[PDB]
Amino acid sequence: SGKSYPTVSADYQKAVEKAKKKLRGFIAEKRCAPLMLRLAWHSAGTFDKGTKTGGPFGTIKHPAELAHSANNGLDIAVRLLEPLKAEFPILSYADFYQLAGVVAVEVTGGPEVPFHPGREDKPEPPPEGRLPDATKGSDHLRDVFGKAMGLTDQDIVALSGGHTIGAAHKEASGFEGPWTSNPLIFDNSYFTELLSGEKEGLLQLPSDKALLSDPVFRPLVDKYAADEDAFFADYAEAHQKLSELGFADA
Numbered sequence: 001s002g003k004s005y006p007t008v009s010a011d012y013q014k015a016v017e018k019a020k021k022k023l024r025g026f027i028a029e030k031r032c033a034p035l036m037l038r039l040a041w042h043s044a045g046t047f048d049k050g051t052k053t054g055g056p057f058g059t060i061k062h063p064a065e066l067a068h069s070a071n072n073g074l075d076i077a078v079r080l081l082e083p084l085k086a087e088f089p090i091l092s093y094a095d096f097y098q099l100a101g102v103v104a105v106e107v108t109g110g111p112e113v114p115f116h117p118g119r120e121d122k123p124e125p126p127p128e129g130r131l132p133d134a135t136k137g138s139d140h141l142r143d144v145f146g147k148a149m150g151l152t153d154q155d156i157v158a159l160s161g162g163h164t165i166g167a168a169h170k171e172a173s174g175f176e177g178p179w180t181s182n183p184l185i186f187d188n189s190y191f192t193e194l195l196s197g198e199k200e201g202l203l204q205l206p207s208d209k210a211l212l213s214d215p216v217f218r219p220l221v222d223k224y225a226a227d228e229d230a231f232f233a234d235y236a237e238a239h240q241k242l243s244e245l246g247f248a249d250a
């Protein structure tokens, strides 16, 4: 992994464990798992490996970053978490948001993504424009996930599977509707829907469709559609990597 995780105090570790439980209950009750996953992903996805800037360091709560067009509708997520965060003053926002992402996947029935504490809250949000454009294709996905974040082609396909929960909103991105018939259930249905073609009532972004036509991405879509266990394994790996971009050296 190339990771050396920092030491945190026993009190910090206790807070992580307690916050994890409180997050399960809150996220399940509020039905906001997909929104919390999006919040964690948009926090982390700004990492640029060349300059070591952006990444999961608490900056998404900053008015300046929330205002990024890619982040439309995430102000809600930040507000929803503020009362719970206030119960855990010892935790960084950085850790709290990544923990919420991990919990979002868990409570919707997804894999248990390993979590290591210690991210510091950094003062400077990254510049706008690093998050992917839903209207573009495979070259663009590699620029963003590969050239900037430093994730693999496998990670790209697995992480796209995060769309197995949630929906787009015409008031946020402009796109509208869920990718799956069960948007609060984490499973491999995203890939199965991708393969079956356009079904009325279900969403496919151009960026999703790009996975089907790329020589490297397509076999991965096929694998995940055929084998949910393989999806969960590769997803857990990718999510952990994403949640740790720029953190614990690397």
Ligand code: HEM
Residues within 6 Å of the ligand: 033, 034, 035, 037, 038, 041, 073, 132, 133, 134, 135, 141, 159, 160, 161, 162, 163, 165, 166, 167, 168, 169, 170, 172, 173, 174, 175, 205, 207
């Ligand atoms: C591959 C490039 C990606 C593109 C172009 C993209 C684009 C989008 C767009 C346009 C929306 C709709 C936002 C709205 O209108 O509410 C969305 C929602 C969402 N995204 Fe992605 N995304 C990508 C990757 C990811 C990744 C890597 C994850 C996490 C692993 C993720 C998780 C989600 C979730 C859970 C939602 C639903 C949010 C909700 O229900 O409110 N996406 N994405």
Ligand code: NA
Residues within 6 Å of the ligand: 164, 165, 180, 181, 182, 183, 184, 185, 186, 187, 189, 190
């Ligand atoms: Na689903």
